[PDB]
Design a protein around this ligand. Structure first.
Ligand SMILES: [Mg+2]
Ligand SMILES: [Mg+2]
Ligand SMILES: [Mg+2]
Lengths: 72, 66, 93, 110
RNA sequence: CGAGCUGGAGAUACGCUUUGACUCGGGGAUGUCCGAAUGGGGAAACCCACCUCGUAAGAGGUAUCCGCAAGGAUGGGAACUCAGGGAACUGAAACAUCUCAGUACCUGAAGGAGAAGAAAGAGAAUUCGAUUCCGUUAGUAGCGGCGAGCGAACCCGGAUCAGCCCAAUCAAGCCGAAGUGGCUGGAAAGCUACACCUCAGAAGGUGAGAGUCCUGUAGGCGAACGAGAGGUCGUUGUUCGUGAAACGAUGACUGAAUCCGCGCGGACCACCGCGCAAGGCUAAAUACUCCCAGUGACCGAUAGCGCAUAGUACCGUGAGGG
RNA sequence: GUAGGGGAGCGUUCAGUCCGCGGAGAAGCCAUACCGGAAGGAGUGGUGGAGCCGACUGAAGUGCGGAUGCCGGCAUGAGUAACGAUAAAAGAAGUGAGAAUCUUCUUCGCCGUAAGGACAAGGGUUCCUGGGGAAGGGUCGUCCGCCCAGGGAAAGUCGGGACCUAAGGUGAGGCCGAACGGCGCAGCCGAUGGACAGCAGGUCAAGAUUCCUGCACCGAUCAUGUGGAGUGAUGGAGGG
């Protein structure tokens, strides 16, 4: 989980074959289709006073610049 | 028993009108077990009294302070 | 107070033939720690107690009716006053 | 088991009134009410009688034979009567006991 | 409310009832122990403490989370609602796509309803104009190992119909018309002969079949006081399974403008056109049904709920079955 | 004339409507040599004790011997095999409506590291007394571990708790996690282990280091005296 917004939770992953032909081969034969997820990272930050909290890149980025309610 | 001649008394008397019945209510309860309880109702009555002997007392607990 | 708690006198014969020696026994309440009870009695019959002894007791009966039974649970208690024998007269019963 | 509700645990009379057993046996017979069991629709009126044998086993010197007792009935008797014949009830009001209401038929008493 | 009552129990004894019991309505007061359970422990209903108020008996506080503070939260709800996670059997006469399905199940949150909602919309008329629900359009457009099979929306009819705000009568209950004789019978409300009521001939009961015996019904009354941003990669949703495939969505990298400004109108461009996103709250029509009343070309005891009552007996270590 | 197609009808419930029927007696049951082309229908009698035929039309959980079908009742095997260790039993006497089978006596036989005795766990009242005599007891039963009622269980020191800790459990504040949740120091719970004050007898029908009798020990609180001064932690060490 992250600072500004939750995150994690993701969706399926496909893998076809016959992949790409004359402007089109015959087509795309899918051979996969399953399921995955994606997470992030963190570094100690803190508001009100000291803390640590999980901090997502896109957050540590946006926060590294103009601070929003929370301070790097 | 219940009318303005029940509350009529002292809070302590209420107790006296309590701690005395359950003193009868005992000797009664004994009798029974010992066989001779010929006042089955007495029990229920004496009991019913104690009820009142508190409900009232309790009615005061809000009238004179809210 | 005092008059509270006790539940009734233990009739039976042993109890009775236990009385002839100034040992009175009656049924107190299940929850009634040996002290409270020691107290109560004293102040209901006016008298001390040199010794006390108490233990719990189950019930489960019936006559019939597919209604089996069910315990009823009691707590006989047995006391012993000081040489100043007797209690009221609810002894010589 | 339903029971005496079809009516409405309401005895169209008092355990003291006089009544005529209309319908059933003992038609027209009359007597003072004695037991008014509203719930069950039971009425004990000196009218009907029975001679029952008391089941008195080791009942301190048995000698049990056959008593004469009254056996209760239902709405098989029409409460109160004044024209000497059964009568509905309708014209009430009050007395010096406006603290109450009466009843009456063609006539007006009870 | 007016003779009875003393629970089912069918029994005896004691008794209680006009200074109107009982019973029915409607508020209070009591409400041991366990249970979110929360003084601490705990193999539920037990075992042990402490502080304060105190006649001692006895009273009360002693949990964690938000908040100065009031005050709010933890739990429990048959089904209905949304959300996070999400099968397989099965079909395709095999099978990996696809189908079965985002169903079943798990979990979180909530209410009596929810969800949704006031346009960077849908549509091709320079039209409509929040959301939702029923009809239809249509099994049309389309999706599809273009196989099995899956399947819209606009328009139009109808339920109902609001947009507002930020940031820069139902319950208790009371009153309530009108018949007798004779006959059959164990008993008549049946037969028979005369009679009555009818804004009450709905219904149940009464020794067999009841307008006029009882309870009722039509109709009338009826209370202290009680309710009502763009993109690239990976993927995905909508008919959208990669296809020329838009748009929406987001995990990862990036990263704009602002009126001679911005988005979209299914790649893409111009032209034409509709709308102004990154803040929010919102009745109502919608769903279900533990509970209640009414009804039934529904059952009437191997039927009907499992139960004319029992989740009991009985079976299982248990979930559970019954 | 088999699979199959087509035709006309019988019967069962429920519903609407018509004609009715019934306590001097409905439905259902039972018997029968009648009737109709069948499915089926009627008459009469018996039973029964309250609802019920016939006709037209409508709707059906609508018609049975089969499914190792389902529930229930009753048969066959048949009075057959069994009566659950080959540690035997005999007599007398007693009770009783009735006893091989109960009680008493006197013998016999079997176990005796047990088939004796004391606990644990587990079960609960099964214990004792008086009654009982359906069913249970593989047979009798006057008896029972069965049925009914009453009684019985007594602890400052025995076990446990108000003390301790092991595995393990839990766990403020901490580390992780789609949810639920997963881990986790101190602390806490946690015996099966540690620690800790009594013995000898008597004796209810039925209890005993619990009650009584004799004598004892431990802690606590107070008073008295002695004393005449420190007392000594959630910490250290020793020890357990
Ligand atoms: Mg039957
Ligand atoms: Mg039930
Ligand atoms: Mg068969």
């Amino acid at each position: 989980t992250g600072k500004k917004n939750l995150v994690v939770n993701s969706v399926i992953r496909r893998g076809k074959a016959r992949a790409d032909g004359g402007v089109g081969r015959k087509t795309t034969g899918i051979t996969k289709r399953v399921q995955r997820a994606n997470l992030h990272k963190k570094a100690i930050r803190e508001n009100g006073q000291v803390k640590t909290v999980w901090l997502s890149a896109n957050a540590l980025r946006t926060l590294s610049k103009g601070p929003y309610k929370g301070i790097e | 028993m219940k009318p303005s001649e029940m509350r009529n008394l002292q809070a302590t008397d209420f107790a006296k009108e309590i701690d005395a019945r359950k003193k009868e209510l005992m000797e009664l309860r004994f009798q029974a077990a010992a066989g001779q309880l010929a006042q089955p109702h007495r029990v229920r009555q004496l009991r019913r009294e104690v009820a009142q002997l508190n409900t009232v007392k309790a009615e005061l607990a809000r009238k004179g302070e809210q | 107070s005092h008059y509270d708690i006790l539940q009734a006198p233990v009739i039976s014969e042993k109890a009775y033939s236990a009385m002839e020696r100034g040992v009175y026994s009656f049924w107190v309440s299940p929850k009634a720690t040996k002290t409270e009870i020691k107290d109560a009695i004293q102040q209901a019959f006016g008298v001390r107690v040199i010794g006390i002894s108490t233990m719990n007791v189950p019930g489960k009966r019936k006559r019939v009716g597919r209604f089996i039974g069910q315990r009823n649970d009691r707590k006989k208690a047995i006391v012993r006053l000081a040489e100043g024998q007797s209690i009221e007269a609810l002894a010589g019963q | 088991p339903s029971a005496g509700s079809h009516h409405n645990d309401k005895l169209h009379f008092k355990k003291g009134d006089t009544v005529i057993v209309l319908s059933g046996k003992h038609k027209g017979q009359t007597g003072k009410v004695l037991l008014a069991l509203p719930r069950d629709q039971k009425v004990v009126v000196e009218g009907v009688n029975v001679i029952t044998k008391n089941v008195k086993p080791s009942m301190t010197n048995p000698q049990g034979g056959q008593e004469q007792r009254e056996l209760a009935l239902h709405a098989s008797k029409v409460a109160l009567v004044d024209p000497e014949t059964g009568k509905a009830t309708r014209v009430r009001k009050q007395i010096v006991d406006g603290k109450k209401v009466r009843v009456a038929v063609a006539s007006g008493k009870t």
